[PDB]
DNA sequence: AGATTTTATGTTTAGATCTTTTATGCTTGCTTTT
C-alpha cells in the first residue's frame, strides 16, 4: 500500500535513491587535456580556496568564529549582485568552521540551512529547517511550534547553531511573519542561533522590510562587488590550472568583455566552456583568440538584424511600413489601420500586391509571436495597437545593408 | 470517401462542392487527416447539421470516435475535456475523470492502436468563437492535438465568423479555412423547392378539394409559387430556415382559389406583404397602475426634456441621465393633484425599474444617497398611449 | 561595469534634457545605443540591455515600475545626479556623455 | 484497375509524408551538430549543460529535437544511462502540474502508477532531494521544455529557478533545453534564473529565403523518394520504434513504387515545376509566408484533390489552390449578406466618410437609411424592426464592433476598409441598381 | 383555461433543431403568479408527462450558476416525483441521468423562466443556445414569464437566437378584470356577514 | 481485523489589496443673456 511508502517518506526512514547508470563512467586518464580544461572549467567545480575573496573570508570567518566562540547568537547580512561568489564564500567559512570544530579547535555547532526559492511558500521554510534538525516531515504549524519549543526554552546543553538562509527576498511577504521569527529567534537568550542571510538588493532591509524587521536585522553587513578586469582573469587561470590549453590574450578578452557587462563569474565560465568546445570542433589543441571571439559572439547574441533579413517580403514591408507611421505620427503606438494605409503606399511604390487585410492580421500576428512587434489579440481588427519592438535604426540595416 | 459523399448530397442541395471538400479532407479514414479545419459562413448556411450528418455517416461507415461539441456549453475547460473524452473514448462509465489539458492528451494517447485496423478520431467544436474567451490554453491545444496525441486525428472548428478574428498574441497553428458561401436565389428557390413531396403528402392527408388540389399541386406550382415568394421576401433575408417557416403559412394562405375554384398573385401579395412585416418574429398593450403611468411619463419627459427646460417648463446623443428627486419634481409638476409621498410611490419606481421599463445607467450601489442616476427605456408612442388613456397631454411639455 | 556607466550616463543625459521623466527601458535603450555608436564600441541588445538595467536596480540607483511588456518597463531614477557623478568616477565619460545633445 | 490504386498510395503516401514526418530534418547543419554533440556530452560525460532553441514559427525545432533524439536514443549508452523528461508549456499550466510530470517521467519512489502523492512542496522537496543524492554515478536527465516562454510566466520562476541550478551544482547530470518561439526569452528571466543560464543561444531561422532553395523544397516534398532510400529510412524507423510518436510516424515500408511510377510521377512534377505559372503561384506563396509549414499546409490541399479520374498534378491545380488561399474572406462574408444589410453597410460607409470616422448609432444609420428608402421604391416596404434586426445580423458578424446604454444607442466601430466594401459592390450577385447608384453618392 | 393550454402544449411536443417555447404574456403583478406556475407543475406531474425546473432570476447571476441550478432542478424534481453536489450537476449528467431513466419509455424537459424581464441578457442568451444545442438528444420546452409584452421579447432575443425559437404566445387574463371578479363574487356576496 | 465518521491538510477560487490611470463630478472662476 501506498500510505506505508508515505509514512516512510515523511518519517524520514527511507533515503530518496536516484537510479545509477548501467555503465561506468569513464576514466581520468582517457581525458584529453582540452577535455580537462573543459571540466575544470565547468561552474559546478567550486574551489577549495576561492581566488580574489579573501578579505570576505575574513569578514565573514571572523564574526561567525566569534559568534560562536561567545555562545551569543546574533545575525548578518551579506549581498551583492549574482554571480559574485557570495554563497560559495559563506559555505567555505561554514566548512572551515567544521574542519576546526572537527579537531576541536573551536566549540561544536549545528548547521542548518535552507533556501528562500526551494520553497512554494515562506512558510514552508519552518518545514524545512525542522527537516534537518530531526528529520521527520510535519505540517508547518506543528514545526513552527516546535521550533518555538527548541528556541525560546533553555535547554543545557544546547549546542551553536547557524541558520544560512539564502535568497532573503522571497521569503518576505506582506505580513513578513516568517522573516521576524528568523529573525526574532537570535534575540531571545535561550537561543544560540546565528543567522545569516543571503540576498541580492544592497538596500533591502530598508526597502522592503519592515522597521522592526530591519531593526532586528542589524548593522553589521557585507557588500560583495562585481569582479573586475582582473579578477576574472585570475578566477579563470586559477581554474585552468598550469596547463597552456587557453591563451592568456584569450582569457584577458573573456574577462575584459564580461567584467564591462555585468561582473558575473558564471559568465566567463561558460565562455571559456563553450570557446573549448569551439576549439574542439577545429581539431586545434588550444584555445585561439579567435575561437573566444566567436564563443563571445554567440553567447552574447544579437540574432534580430538576422530575424529582420530572414522575414518573408511581405513582412519587410510591414516593418518598414510600422516605422514609416511611427515617424509620420510621431507617437510610438500605432493602430492597424495606418499601418495598412502605408503598408498599401509602400506595396504600390514596390510595385508588389499586398494581401487583403484578413491575412495581414496574420503577418502582424507572426511578427508578434515571434516578438519583433509587440500586438493585441487579432479579434479588435483595424483598431489594435502596434507597437515596435525592434529599433527602427534596425530596420533599415537590415533591409538596406 | 465516395460513399458518404454519395450519402449525404441527396440531404444536401447545392452543397456538393462542400461535401466534396470535406470528403477529400476527413473522408478515408486510412488517409492521414489534416491537424485542423475551419469552416465557416453565416447563419442558416447549414455548418452544423453538415458536420453532424457527416460525422454521423463517418461513425457508421467507418472506425472513426466521432465528438461533437458546443462551446458555449464549456464555461470552464473541465467540461469540454470531460465531454470530448466521453465521446472518445467510450464506455467509460462513471469512473472517467480529467483533471486538465494535460490528462487528456495522456488518456488519449492511451487510445493509440495498431495501424493495420485505421482507426480515426474527429471532433467537431460548433460555437467556435467563444474558444478565444476561455482559458487561452485551449485553441492553441486544440490545432495541433494531432501532433500532441499521435493520433490521427482532426479536429473541425465551426463558427460564424473568419479566421482572421483568431489569432492571439503567441500565434496560432495551421490550419485548413473552408467557406460556406450563402445561397443566390436560384439555389435558394431549389433548396425550398426540394421539399415538395412532402408539403404534398402533407395536403394530400388533408372530399373535392383533395381531388381538386392532387391534379393541380404539381412540381412548376410549387416553383412558380416559390418564385413569387422569393420576388418579395429575399429582399430582407437569404436564411433558408426562416424562408421554410415562412413559405409554408404563405403556402397555407395562397392555396385557398386553387382549392375553391397568375390568377392568384394579388391575392397573395395582399398578405404576402403583410408576413413580410412579421419576418423574424417567430410567433405562432402593457397595462398599468395609474400613478406608476404618470411616473413613466414623467421619466420620460426627464429623459427627453433636458436638464435646463424644467425650469421654464414646470415652475407655472441618447436619452438624459435623471436622478430620482427630478423625477418625483417633474411627477409632481405634471400630477396636478399632489398626492402624498407614501411607500407604494417609491415602491412604484423601484417596480418600474426592475420590469427593464427604466433603467440604472450609474449609481446602483447608493441608491438612497442620491448619487444614483436613472434612464428612462421607451419609446414615444408607448408615452402617446400612455397620455391618451390617462388623459395627460404630453405633447406640450415637449 | 562600462555598460552599466554608459547606461547611468545616457539616463543622466535624458533627464536632464527633457521635461518628461517618463522614461521607458526602450526609450532609453534607444539613446543608449547612439551613445554607444558614437564611443565607437560595441552596444548590448535589448534582451542583455534590460538584465544590465536590472543589476543597476540592485544598488538602489534605480527604480523599475513593471509594466506588461519589457521594453514598456519605466526606469525611475532614485539618487540625485550629484551623487550619481560621484558615483561613476570617471569625470572625463560623463563630460563626454552629458555635452552629447545631439545622439537624443 | 491497378492504375486506380497506384494512385490512391501515391496519395496516401504523400499525405503521409506531409503530416507524419517527426524525425527527418532538411537543413540546420551546424545547429542539429550543436544539440546532438551537447546531448552526447551530457550523456556520456556527465556535463551539466543547458541549451535554449529558438526561432520563428514553423521553423523544425521540434523536428530538430526528434531528429537528435531518434539519432541518439539506439545507441544502446544514451538510451541507457539518460532518462528524458519532456514538459510542455501548454500542458503544465502551474508548476505544480510539471512538478507531478516530472515526478511521474523520473519514476520516482513517490510516483507509484501515475498518481504522485504529497504536497507541492513534498513533491519539490523530494525531487530536490533525489537530485542532490545523485552524482556522476547516477543516470543523467534530459529535460526538454517546449513552450519556454510560458514557464518563464510562472511564479517566482521557481521550478526553473531549480532546474537550472543542478545544472550549476555538483548533482545529477541535467541538462535543460527550453524550446521556444520569442527572440527575446532571456529577458523575462529573473536575474538568478538569468545567471543560472548558460547563456548559448540556437537560432533556428529557415534556410529557404532565396526562392529557389522554396521550389527545390516543393519539389523534394511532392516526389517520391528511390525504394533503396524506402529501405533506409524503414530500417531507420524500425530501430526506434524498437526500443513518444514512434507508435504513429510515418513507416514508409509499407508502400513500394514501381520504378516507372516513380519515373512517371517525377517527371510529371520536374515539368510542372519547370512552368511559369506553377513558379508564379509558388512565388506568391513564398511572397506570403516563407515557413515550411505554409508550404506543407498548401501541398496538403493540392494532394487532396487527386482523384483517380485525374491522377496528374497540374499547373492550374496550383493555381487554384493559391486562388483559394489568396482571396479575402470578409469580402466573401459581404457577399452573402442581403441587400437590407448591405444598405446599412452603404449607410455606414456614407457616415464615415462623411464624419471621419466618427463611431456611429443604430439611430444614425437608421435615419441615413431611411432617406434613401422613402425615395428607394423598393424598400419602403421594411419595418423599424427589420432593420434592427438587421444591424444585430451585422454586430455578430464582427463586420461592426462596440466601443469598448441601450442597444439600439450602443456607439459602435466599423470594422472594414473602404476599399473592402468597394469590391464587395462589384463582387455582389443581382445587386438592384438603385443601391448601385445610391453606393456612388 | 390557460392552464389546459399549455399542457396541451406540453403534451403536444412530447407526441413529437429549434426549441418549442411558450410566452405567457401575463400582468405587472408578478409575486401572484408563482401559484399559477404551481398549478402547472403540479398538471404535468399527475399527468406523468413532464418534469419542471424553475429558474429563478436570482438563482441565475451567471452562466454557470443558471446550468447548475438548472439540472439540480432537473434531478431533484424527478427525485421528489417519486442529493448530487451542486458543483458537479454538469449538462452532461443531466444527459446521462435522462438516458438512465427515460430513454425506455418521452418526459419533456419544462424550465419555467417566471421572471423573464429580470435576467441577464448574456446569461439567458447563452442559456437559449445551450438548450438550443441539446434538443432531439434532450427534450426541452421554454415556458417563460412576460411581464411587460412581446416587444420585450424580441428586443432581448437577437438574430442569432431567435433563430432558434419557436414560441407560442399564451395570454392571462387582465388584473383589473381579476379585481372585478374578486369584488363581485366575494366582498358583495350575500352569505358573508 | 475491517468499515465510519473525524479531523487535519492542501488546493482553488472568490474576495481583499496595492497601484496606476483615467473620468465624471463637485466646486470654482469667470462669462454672458435677460
Ligand atoms: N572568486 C571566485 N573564485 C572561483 N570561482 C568562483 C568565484 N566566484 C564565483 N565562482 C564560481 O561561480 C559560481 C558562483 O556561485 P555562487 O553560489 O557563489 O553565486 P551567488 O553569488 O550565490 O549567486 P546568487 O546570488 O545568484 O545566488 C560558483 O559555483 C563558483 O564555482
Ligand atoms: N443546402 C441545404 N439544403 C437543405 N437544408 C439546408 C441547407 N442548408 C441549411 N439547411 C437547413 O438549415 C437548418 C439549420 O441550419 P444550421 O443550424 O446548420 O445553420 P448554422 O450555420 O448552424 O446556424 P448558426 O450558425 O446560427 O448556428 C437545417 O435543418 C438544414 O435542413
Ligand atoms: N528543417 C525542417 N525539416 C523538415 N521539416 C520541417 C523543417 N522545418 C519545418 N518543417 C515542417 O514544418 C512543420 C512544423 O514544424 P515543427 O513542428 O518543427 O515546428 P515547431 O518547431 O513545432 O514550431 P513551434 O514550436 O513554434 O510550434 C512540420 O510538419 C515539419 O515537417
Ligand atoms: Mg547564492
Ligand atoms: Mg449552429
Ligand atoms: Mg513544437
Known sequence: ?401 | ?398 | ?104 | ?441 | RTLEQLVDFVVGQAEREVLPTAALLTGINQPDHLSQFTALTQRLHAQRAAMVCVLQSRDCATLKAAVETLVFGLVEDNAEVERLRRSQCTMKQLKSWYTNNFDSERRQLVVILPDFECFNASVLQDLILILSAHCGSLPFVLVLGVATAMTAVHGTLPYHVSSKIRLRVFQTQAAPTGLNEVLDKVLLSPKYA
Open chain 4, 1 to 441: 484497375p491497378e492504375a486506380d490504386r497506384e494512385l490512391v498510395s501515391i496519395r496516401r503516401f504523400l499525405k503521409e509524408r506531409l503530416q507524419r514526418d517527426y524525425t527527418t530534418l532538411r537543413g540546420y547543419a551546424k545547429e542539429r551538430s550543436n544539440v546532438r554533440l551537447l546531448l552526447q556530452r551530457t550523456a556520456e560525460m556527465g556535463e551539466s549543460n543547458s541549451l535554449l532553441l529558438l526561432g520563428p514559427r514553423g521553423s523544425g525545432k521540434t523536428t530538430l529535437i526528434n531528429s537528435v533524439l531518434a539519432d541518439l536514443l539506439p545507441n544502446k549508452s544514451f538510451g541507457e544511462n539518460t532518462l528524458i523528461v519532456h514538459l510542455d508549456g501548454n500542458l503544465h499550466t502551474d508548476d505544480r502540474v510539471a512538478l507531478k510530470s516530472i515526478t511521474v517521467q523520473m519514476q520516482l519512489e513517490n510516483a507509484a502508477d501515475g498518481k504522485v502523492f504529497g504536497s507541492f512542496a513534498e513533491n519539490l522537496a523530494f525531487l530536490l532531494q533525489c537530485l542532490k543524492a545523485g552524482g556522476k554515478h547516477s543516470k543523467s536527465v534530459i529535460f526538454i521544455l517546449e513552450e519556454f516562454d510560458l514557464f518563464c510566466a510562472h511564479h517566482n520562476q521557481t521550478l526553473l529557478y531549480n532546474l537550472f541550478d543542478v545544472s550549476q551544482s555538483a548533482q545529477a547530470p541535467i541538462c535543460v533545453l527550453g524550446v521556444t518561439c520569442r527572440l527575446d526569452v532571456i529577458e523575462l528571466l529573473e536575474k538568478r534564473v538569468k545567471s543560472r543560464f548558460s547563456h548559448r543561444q540556437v537560432f533556428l531561422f529557415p534556410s529557404l529565403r532565396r526562392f529557389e532553395d522554396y521550389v527545390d523544397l516543393c519539389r523534394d516534398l511532392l516526389s517520391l523518394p528511390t525504394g533503396n532510400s524506402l529501405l533506409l529510412a524503414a530500417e531507420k524507423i524500425y530501430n526506434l520504434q524498437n526500443i513518444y510518436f514512434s507508435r504513429n510516424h510515418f513507416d514508409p515500408g509499407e508502400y513500394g513504387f514501381s520504378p516507372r511510377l516513380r519515373d512517371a510521377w517525377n517527371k510529371q512534377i520536374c515539368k510542372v515545376l519547370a512552368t511559369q505559372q506553377a513558379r508564379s503561384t509558388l512565388q506568391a506563396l513564398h511572397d506570403f509566408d516563407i515557413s515550411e509549414a505554409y508550404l506543407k499546409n498548401f501541398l496538403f490541399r493540392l494532394v487532396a484533390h487527386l482523384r483517380p479520374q485525374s491522377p496528374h498534378i497540374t499547373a492550374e491545380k496550383m493555381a487554384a489552390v493559391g486562388s483559394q488561399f489568396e482571396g479575402d474572406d470578409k469580402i466573401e462574408l459581404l457577399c452573402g449578406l442581403s441587400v437590407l444589410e448591405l444598405c446599412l453597410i452603404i449607410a455606414i460607409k456614407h457616415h464615415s466618410q462623411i464624419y471621419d470616422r466618427d463611431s456611429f448609432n443604430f439611430e444614425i444609420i437608421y435615419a441615413r437609411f431611411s432617406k434613401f428608402a422613402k425615395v428607394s421604391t423598393t424598400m419602403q416596404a421594411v419595418e423599424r424592426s427589420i432593420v434592427l434586426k438587421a444591424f444585430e445580423h451585422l454586430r455578430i458578424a464582427e463586420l461592426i464592433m462596440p466601443l469598448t446604454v441601450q442597444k439600439e444607442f450602443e456607439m459602435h466601430k466599423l470594422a472594414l476598409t473602404y476599399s473592402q466594401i468597394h469590391h464587395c459592390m462589384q463582387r455582389y450577385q443581382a445587386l438592384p441598381t438603385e443601391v448601385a447608384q445610391w453606393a456612388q453618392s
Open chain 2, 1 to 398: 470517401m465516395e460513399a458518404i459523399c454519395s450519402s449525404l448530397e441527396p440531404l444536401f442541395p447545392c452543397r456538393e462542392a462542400a461535401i466534396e471538400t470535406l470528403g477529400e479532407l476527413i473522408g478515408d479514414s486510412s488517409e492521414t487527416y489534416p491537424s485542423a479545419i475551419y469552416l465557416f459562413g453565416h447563419s442558416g448556411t447549414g455548418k452544423t447539421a453538415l458536420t453532424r450528418a457527416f460525422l454521423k455517416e463517418c461513425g457508421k461507415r467507418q472506425n472513426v470516435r466521432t465528438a461533437h461539441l458546443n462551446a458555449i456549453e464549456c464555461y470552464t475547460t473541465k467540461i469540454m475535456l470531460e465531454i470530448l473524452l466521453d465521446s472518445l473514448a467510450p464506455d467509460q462509465g462513471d469512473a472517467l475523470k480529467v483533471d486538465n489539458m494535460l490528462d487528456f492528451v495522456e488518456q488519449l494517447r492511451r487510445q493509440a492502436a495498431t495501424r493495420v485496423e485505421d482507426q480515426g478520431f474527429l471532433i467537431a467544436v460548433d460555437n467556435a468563437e467563444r474558444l478565444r474567451d476561455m482559458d487561452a490554453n485551449v485553441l492553441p491545444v486544440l490545432l495541433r492535438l494531432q501532433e500532441l496525441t499521435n493520433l490521427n486525428l482532426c479536429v473541425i472548428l465551426l463558427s460564424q465568423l473568419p479566421f482572421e478574428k483568431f489569432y492571439n498574441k503567441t500565434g496560432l497553428s495551421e490550419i485548413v479555412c473552408l467557406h460556406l458561401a450563402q445561397y443566390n436565389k436560384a439555389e435558394t428557390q431549389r433548396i425550398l423547392g426540394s421539399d415538395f413531396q412532402q408539403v404534398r403528402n402533407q395536403l394530400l392527408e388533408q372530399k373535392k378539394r383533395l381531388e381538386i388540389c392532387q391534379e393541380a399541386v404539381t412540381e412548376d406550382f410549387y416553383n412558380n409559387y416559390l418564385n413569387l415568394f422569393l420576388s418579395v421576401f429575399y429582399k430582407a433575408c437569404r436564411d433558408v430556415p426562416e424562408l421554410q417557416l415562412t413559405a409554408r403559412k404563405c403556402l397555407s394562405t395562397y392555396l385557398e382559389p386553387v382549392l375553391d375554384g397568375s390568377r392568384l398573385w394579388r391575392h397573395i401579395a395582399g398578405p404576402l406583404r403583410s408576413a413580410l412585416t412579421q419576418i423574424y418574429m417567430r410567433i405562432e398593450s402593457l397595462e398599468l397602475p395609474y400613478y406608476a403611468k404618470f411616473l413613466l411619463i414623467a421619466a420620460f419627459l426627464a429623459s427627453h426634456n433636458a436638464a435646463k427646460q424644467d425650469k421654464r417648463l414646470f415652475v407655472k446623443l441618447g436619452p438624459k441621465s435623471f436622478s430620482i428627486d427630478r423625477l418625483l419634481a417633474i411627477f409632481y409638476a405634471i400630477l396636478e393633484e399632489k398626492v402624498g409621498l407614501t411607500c407604494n410611490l417609491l415602491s412604484q419606481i423601484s417596480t418600474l425599474v426592475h420590469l427593464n421599463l427604466l433603467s440604472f445607467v450609474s449609481g446602483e450601489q447608493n441608491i438612497m444617497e442620491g448619487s444614483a442616476r436613472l434612464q428612462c427605456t421607451i419609446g414615444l408612442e408607448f408615452v402617446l398611449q400612455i397620455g391618451k388613456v390617462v388623459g395627460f397631454n404630453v405633447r406640450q411639455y415637449l
Open chain 1, 1 to 401: 500500500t501506498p500510505s506505508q511508502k508515505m509514512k516512510k517518506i515523511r518519517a524520514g526512514e527511507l533515503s530518496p535513491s536516484m537510479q545509477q547508470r548501467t555503465d561506468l563512467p569513464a576514466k581520468d586518464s582517457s581525458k584529453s587535456e582540452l577535455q580537462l580544461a573543459r571540466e575544470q572549467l565547468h561552474v559546478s567545480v567550486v574551489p577549495k580556496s576561492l581566488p580574489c575573496r579573501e578579505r570576505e573570508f575574513e569578514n565573514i570567518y571572523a564574526f561567525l568564529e566569534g559568534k560562536i566562540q561567545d555562545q551569543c547568537g546574533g545575525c548578518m547580512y551579506v549581498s551583492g549582485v549574482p554571480g559574485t561568489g557570495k554563497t560559495a564564500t559563506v559555505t567555505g567559512v561554514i566548512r572551515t568552521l567544521q574542519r576546526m570544530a572537527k579537531q576541536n579547535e573551536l566549540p561544536a555547532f549545528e548547521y542548518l540551512e535552507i533556501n528562500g526559492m526551494r520553497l512554494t511558500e515562506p512558510r514552508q521554510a519552518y518545514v524545512q529547517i525542522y527537516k534537518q534538525l530531526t528529520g521527520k516531515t510535519v505540517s508547518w504549524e506543528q514545526a513552527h511550534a516546535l521550533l518555538e519549543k527548541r528556541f525560546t526554552t533553555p535547554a543545557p546543553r544546547r549546542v551553536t547553531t547557524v541558520l544560512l538562509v539564502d535568497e532573503l527576498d522571497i521569503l518576505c511577504n506582506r505580513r513578513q511573519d516568517v522573516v521576524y521569527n528568523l529573525l526574532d529567534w537570535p534575540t531571545k537568550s535561550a537561543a544560540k542561533l546565528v543567522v545569516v542571510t543571503i540576498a541580492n538588493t544592497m538596500d533591502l532591509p530598508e526597502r522592503l522590510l519592515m522597521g522592526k524587521v530591519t531593526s532586528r536585522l542589524g548593522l553589521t553587513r557585507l557588500t560583495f562587488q562585481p569582479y573586475s578586469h582582473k579578477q576574472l582573469q585570475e578566477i579563470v587561470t586559477a581554474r585552468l590550472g598550469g596547463s597552456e590549453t587557453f591563451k592568456g590574450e584569450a582569457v584577458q578578452l573573456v574577462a575584459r568583455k564580461v567584467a564591462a557587462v555585468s561582473g558575473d563569474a558564471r559568465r566567463a565560465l561558460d565562455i571559456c566552456r563553450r570557446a573549448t568546445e569551439i576549439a574542439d570542433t577545429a581539431a586545434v589543441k588550444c584555445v585561439t583568440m579567435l575561437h573566444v571571439q566567436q564563443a563571445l559572439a554567440e553567447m552574447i547574441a544579437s540574432a534580430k538584424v538576422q530575424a529582420i533579413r530572414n522575414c518573408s517580403r511581405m513582412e519587410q514591408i510591414f516593418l518598414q511600413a510600422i516605422a514609416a507611421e511611427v515617424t509620420r505620427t510621431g507617437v510610438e503606438e500605432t493602430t492597424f489601420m495606418g499601418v495598412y494605409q502605408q503598408v498599401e503606399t509602400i506595396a504600390a511604390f514596390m510595385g508588389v500586391t499586398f494581401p487583403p487585410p484578413g491575412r495581414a492580421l496574420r503577418l502582424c500576428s507572426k511578427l508578434g509571436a515571434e516578438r519583433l512587434i509587440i500586438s493585441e489579440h487579432s479579434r479588435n481588427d483595424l483598431f489594435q495597437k502596434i507597437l515596435l519592438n525592434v529599433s527602427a535604426d534596425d530596420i533599415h540595416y537590415a533591409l538596406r545593408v
Open chain 3, 1 to 104: 561595469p562600462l555598460q552599466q556607466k554608459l547606461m547611468l550616463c545616457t539616463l543622466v543625459l535624458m533627464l536632464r534634457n527633457e521635461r518628461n521623466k517618463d522614461i521607458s527601458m526602450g526609450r532609453l535603450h534607444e539613446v543608449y545605443r547612439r551613445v554607444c555608436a558614437k564611443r565607437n564600441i560595441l552596444a548590448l541588445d535589448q534582451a542583455e540591455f534590460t538584465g544590465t538595467v536590472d543589476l543597476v536596480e540592485t544598488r538602489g540607483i534605480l527604480r523599475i515600475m513593471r509594466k506588461k511588456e519589457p521594453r514598456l518597463h519605466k526606469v525611475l531614477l532614485q539618487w540625485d545626479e550629484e551623487e550619481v557623478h560621484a558615483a561613476l568616477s570617471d569625470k572625463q565619460l560623463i563630460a563626454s556623455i552629458l555635452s552629447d545633445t545631439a545622439c537624443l
